[PDB]
Structures are given as structure tokens and as C-alpha cells.
Scaffold this active site. Structure first.
Site, mmCIF file in Angstrom:
data_model
loop_
_atom_site.group_PDB
_atom_site.id
_atom_site.type_symbol
_atom_site.label_atom_id
_atom_site.label_comp_id
_atom_site.label_asym_id
_atom_site.label_seq_id
_atom_site.Cartn_x
_atom_site.Cartn_y
_atom_site.Cartn_z
ATOM 1 N N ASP A 15 0.800 -1.246 0.000
ATOM 2 C CA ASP A 15 0.000 0.000 0.000
ATOM 3 C C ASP A 15 0.821 1.279 0.000
ATOM 4 O O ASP A 15 0.246 2.345 0.202
ATOM 5 C CB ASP A 15 -1.086 0.006 1.116
ATOM 6 C CG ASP A 15 -0.541 -0.057 2.484
ATOM 7 O OD1 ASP A 15 0.668 0.235 2.646
ATOM 8 O OD2 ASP A 15 -1.372 -0.339 3.409
ATOM 9 N N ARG A 29 0.895 6.806 -0.001
ATOM 10 C CA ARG A 29 0.123 5.812 0.710
ATOM 11 C C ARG A 29 -1.267 5.743 0.014
ATOM 12 O O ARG A 29 -1.951 6.746 -0.190
ATOM 13 C CB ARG A 29 0.020 6.217 2.202
ATOM 14 C CG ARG A 29 -0.887 5.334 3.060
ATOM 15 C CD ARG A 29 -0.388 3.906 3.216
ATOM 16 N NE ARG A 29 -1.078 3.170 4.241
ATOM 17 C CZ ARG A 29 -2.269 2.623 4.103
ATOM 18 N NH1 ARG A 29 -2.961 2.652 2.954
ATOM 19 N NH2 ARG A 29 -2.823 2.020 5.129
ATOM 20 N N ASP A 34 -5.910 -1.071 3.456
ATOM 21 C CA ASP A 34 -4.842 -1.536 4.343
ATOM 22 C C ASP A 34 -4.412 -2.871 3.841
ATOM 23 O O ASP A 34 -5.185 -3.822 3.926
ATOM 24 C CB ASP A 34 -5.324 -1.524 5.771
ATOM 25 C CG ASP A 34 -4.161 -1.624 6.787
ATOM 26 O OD1 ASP A 34 -3.036 -1.129 6.480
ATOM 27 O OD2 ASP A 34 -4.471 -2.219 7.835
ATOM 28 N N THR A 35 -3.185 -2.919 3.374
ATOM 29 C CA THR A 35 -2.526 -4.182 3.077
ATOM 30 C C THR A 35 -1.818 -4.674 4.348
ATOM 31 O O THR A 35 -1.442 -3.928 5.173
ATOM 32 C CB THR A 35 -1.493 -4.048 1.940
ATOM 33 O OG1 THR A 35 -0.634 -2.936 2.155
ATOM 34 C CG2 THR A 35 -2.192 -3.872 0.590
ATOM 35 N N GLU A 37 1.305 -5.809 6.530
ATOM 36 C CA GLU A 37 2.766 -5.508 6.475
ATOM 37 C C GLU A 37 3.472 -6.693 5.878
ATOM 38 O O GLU A 37 2.943 -7.819 5.880
ATOM 39 C CB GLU A 37 3.330 -5.184 7.855
ATOM 40 C CG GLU A 37 2.646 -4.050 8.593
ATOM 41 C CD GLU A 37 2.708 -2.717 7.831
ATOM 42 O OE1 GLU A 37 3.792 -2.495 7.258
ATOM 43 O OE2 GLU A 37 1.685 -1.941 7.739
ATOM 44 N N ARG A 75 3.541 11.342 3.676
ATOM 45 C CA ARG A 75 3.159 10.526 2.559
ATOM 46 C C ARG A 75 2.025 11.146 1.805
ATOM 47 O O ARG A 75 1.077 11.653 2.446
ATOM 48 C CB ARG A 75 2.745 9.095 3.008
ATOM 49 C CG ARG A 75 3.805 8.418 3.788
ATOM 50 C CD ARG A 75 3.477 7.031 4.230
ATOM 51 N NE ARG A 75 2.339 7.038 5.125
ATOM 52 C CZ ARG A 75 1.768 5.988 5.634
ATOM 53 N NH1 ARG A 75 2.294 4.790 5.445
ATOM 54 N NH2 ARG A 75 0.649 6.101 6.321
HETATM 55 C C1 LIG Z 1 -4.466 5.687 4.513
HETATM 56 C C2 LIG Z 1 -4.216 6.762 5.592
HETATM 57 C C3 LIG Z 1 -3.341 6.570 6.664
HETATM 58 N N1 LIG Z 1 -3.154 7.546 7.582
HETATM 59 C C4 LIG Z 1 -2.309 7.352 8.755
HETATM 60 C C5 LIG Z 1 -3.231 6.792 9.812
HETATM 61 C C6 LIG Z 1 -2.352 5.816 10.625
HETATM 62 O O1 LIG Z 1 -1.688 6.544 11.712
HETATM 63 P P1 LIG Z 1 -0.856 5.579 12.729
HETATM 64 O O2 LIG Z 1 0.518 5.476 12.096
HETATM 65 O O3 LIG Z 1 -0.816 6.574 13.813
HETATM 66 O O4 LIG Z 1 -1.441 4.252 12.954
HETATM 67 C C7 LIG Z 1 -1.347 5.381 9.537
HETATM 68 C C8 LIG Z 1 -1.652 4.029 8.952
HETATM 69 O O5 LIG Z 1 -0.797 3.839 7.805
HETATM 70 P P2 LIG Z 1 -0.092 2.397 7.563
HETATM 71 O O6 LIG Z 1 -1.186 1.398 7.355
HETATM 72 O O7 LIG Z 1 0.727 2.629 6.311
HETATM 73 O O8 LIG Z 1 0.739 2.082 8.774
HETATM 74 O O9 LIG Z 1 -1.377 6.294 8.498
HETATM 75 C C9 LIG Z 1 -3.855 8.803 7.418
HETATM 76 O O10 LIG Z 1 -3.661 9.710 8.276
HETATM 77 N N2 LIG Z 1 -4.669 9.032 6.380
HETATM 78 C C10 LIG Z 1 -4.910 8.031 5.446
HETATM 79 O O11 LIG Z 1 -5.730 8.293 4.552
HETATM 80 CA CA LIG Z 2 -0.410 -1.333 5.931
#
Ligand SMILES: Cc1cn([C@H]2C[C@H](OP(=O)(O)O)[C@@H](COP(=O)(O)O)O2)c(=O)[nH]c1=O
Ligand SMILES: [Ca+2]
Length: 129
Positions: A15, A29, A34-35, A37, A75
Site C-alpha cells: 500500500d 500511501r 490496508d494491506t 505488512e 506521505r
Molecule cells: C491511509 C491513511 C493513513 N493515515 C495514517 C493513519 C495511521 O496513523 P498511525 O501510524 O498513527 O497508525 C497510519 C496508517 O498507515 P499504515 O497502514 O501505512 O501504517 O497512516 C492517514 O492519516 N490518512 C490516510 O488516509
Molecule cells: Ca499497511
């Protein structure tokens, strides 16, 4: 929404991908998904899936939604297309991502992706198996 050009710099995981956008390197991103890890079940298959899709593409495009364009990690938040096919949706349709992180204002394609997820679940694909 509209599609804008970008070019692949490097596949990262299911992702996230590094693209050159407006001539700058950025990590994107994928919206609405959500893929797993890489270290998780189906993580490698997701990573491979996204990698193939973006590397084989002649044309990469990014599509921002109406809301925030960057997350808190810097991102880019976008729908990514590979020769017209949306990676975000393709991952979901194949059971390699869950619809997730659906925030008010960046949810234009939500119902499209949920439809894909329903079909992946019906087919018991991958994550839903
Ligand atoms: C997809 C996405 C993720 N995020 C943030 C939320 C999550 O915060 P936390 O890091 O605090 O959990 C994190 C999840 O991304 P990942 O799934 O890449 O880890 O990315 C956003 O803020 N907006 C979005 O649209
Ligand atoms: Ca992920």
C-alpha cells in the site's frame, strides 16, 4: 477528481510506493486500503501484487481526493492508477487489502472499493479465505 502524471521510482509494499510527482520524489500511501505488512500473512503477496502492477505499467497516474493530500508522515494520499486500472481497487478485489482508513472528505471512491471487497469476500480470496 482528476488524474495527474507520475512515474515510478520504487515499489515499497502493498500500500505504499515511491513515485516522482511534479518532478519530486514522494512516498504515496494508497487511500482507503490496508494491506498486511510484509512480515504478516499475505504481506508478501500484497507487496508483489502492487510491485507488478506499478512496474509493468506504461502510465502511472495519481488521483488525489478532495481532502488532505499528505498524511502526518509526509506521505501523499492518493488513488494510484496503472494503465487506467486503480491499484487501490485491484488490491481489494483480490482480497489482498481491506477497505480501511475511510476518513470524511477523502472518500470519493469508497463505495467502489466496498463493492470490490464484497466480491473478494464472496470468492473467499486470500485474506477472506
Ligand atoms: C491511509 C491513511 C493513513 N493515515 C495514517 C493513519 C495511521 O496513523 P498511525 O501510524 O498513527 O497508525 C497510519 C496508517 O498507515 P499504515 O497502514 O501505512 O501504517 O497512516 C492517514 O492519516 N490518512 C490516510 O488516509
Ligand atoms: Ca499497511
Amino acid at each position: 477528481l482528476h488524474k495527474e502524471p507520475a512515474t515510478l521510482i520504487k515499489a515499497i509494499d502493498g500500500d505504499t510506493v515511491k513515485l516522482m510527482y511534479k518532478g519530486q520524489p514522494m512516498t504515496f500511501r494508497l487511500l482507503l486500503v490496508d494491506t498486511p505488512e510484509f512480515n504478516e500473512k499475505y504481506g508478501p503477496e500484497a507487496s508483489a501484487f502492487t510491485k507488478k502492477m506499478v512496474e509493468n505499467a506504461k502510465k502511472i497516474e495519481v488521483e488525489f481526493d478532495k481532502g488532505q493530500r499528505t498524511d502526518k508522515y509526509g506521505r501523499g494520499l492518493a488513488h494510484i492508477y496503472a494503465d487506467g486500472k486503480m491499484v487501490n481497487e485491484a488490491l481489494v478485489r483480490q482480497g489482498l487489502a481491506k477497505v480501511a482508513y475511510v476518513y470524511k472528505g477523502n472518500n470519493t471512491h469508497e463505495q467502489l472499493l466496498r463493492k470490490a471487497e464484497a466480491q473478494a469476500k464472496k470468492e473467499k480470496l486470500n485474506i477472506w479465505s
